[PDB]
């Protein structure tokens, strides 16, 4: 019995750690993407108002 329980604990633990590593990587990927979108939108919006004003 107990060796199968140790395997079940090891599998569940490894899935929890693997899922945490994937979720951390996704949150970091979205952090860089939404930085690119927001920075680009913000600079390009104000740059156009300055261009029409001058």
């Amino acid at each position: 019995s107990d060796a199968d329980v140790q395997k079940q604990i090891k599998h569940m633990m490894a899935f929890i750690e693997q899922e945490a590593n994937e979720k951390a990587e996704e949150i970091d990927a979205k952090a860089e993407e939404e930085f690119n979108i927001e920075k680009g939108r913000l600079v390009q919006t104000q740059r156009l108002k300055i261009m029409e004003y001058y």
Binding site: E33, E34, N36, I37, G40, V43, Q44, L48, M51
Partner: protein, 170 residues
């Protein structure tokens, strides 16, 4: 050998020949249909998304600026409003400058297409876009972005659209 189109206006046969050599296997041997043209349908980004909303195949974007340079993109997905970047690595930017150049994916990032209520843009990597267009399809901008490693697609970084077309393979 040259492809079949249901009409045309920004492209001459020497532009058709050089584009049709580069389009992916997905769209080789399909007739080209004009989904949107500023000269047929009036000029706005809301009309461009409205005409594109029914589509489910790749598109070719063609732009002529006020300096008469021809450029645009081939895109794997129709131009739609999206919260996040979308598309795949068969997307490319192109220009006739006056010689034909095509800027395929660098492999660096997947920032291919992004559409907003007030703009449409392609590429990313910091504040850069390979191609950005305003809500009016009046002002646009092009600069080198690391998605494509492109040149300036127009004669200038900042440009005015003279006219614009979206073609679909269908």
């Amino acid at each position: 050998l040259p492809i079949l189109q249901s009409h045309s206006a920004l492209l001459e046969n020497m532009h058709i020949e050089q584009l049709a050599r580069r389009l992916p296997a997905r769209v080789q041997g399909y007739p080209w249909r004009l989904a949107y043209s500023t000269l047929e349908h009036g000029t706005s980004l809301k009309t461009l998304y409205r005409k594109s909303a029914s589509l489910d195949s790749p598109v070719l974007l063609v732009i002529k600026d006020m300096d008469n340079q021809i450029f645009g993109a081939y895109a794997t997905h129709p131009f739609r409003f999206s919260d996040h970047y979308y598309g795949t690595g068969e997307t490319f930017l192109y220009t006739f400058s006056p010689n034909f150049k095509v800027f395929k994916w660098s492999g660096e990032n997947s920032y291919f297409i992004n559409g907003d209520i007030s703009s449409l843009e392609l590429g990313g990597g910091g504040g850069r876009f390979g191609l950005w267009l305003d809500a009016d399809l009046y002002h646009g901008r092009s600069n080198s972005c690391s998605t494509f490693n492109n040149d300036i697609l127009s004669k200038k970084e900042d440009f005015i659209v003279q006219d614009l077309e979206v073609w679909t393979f269908e």
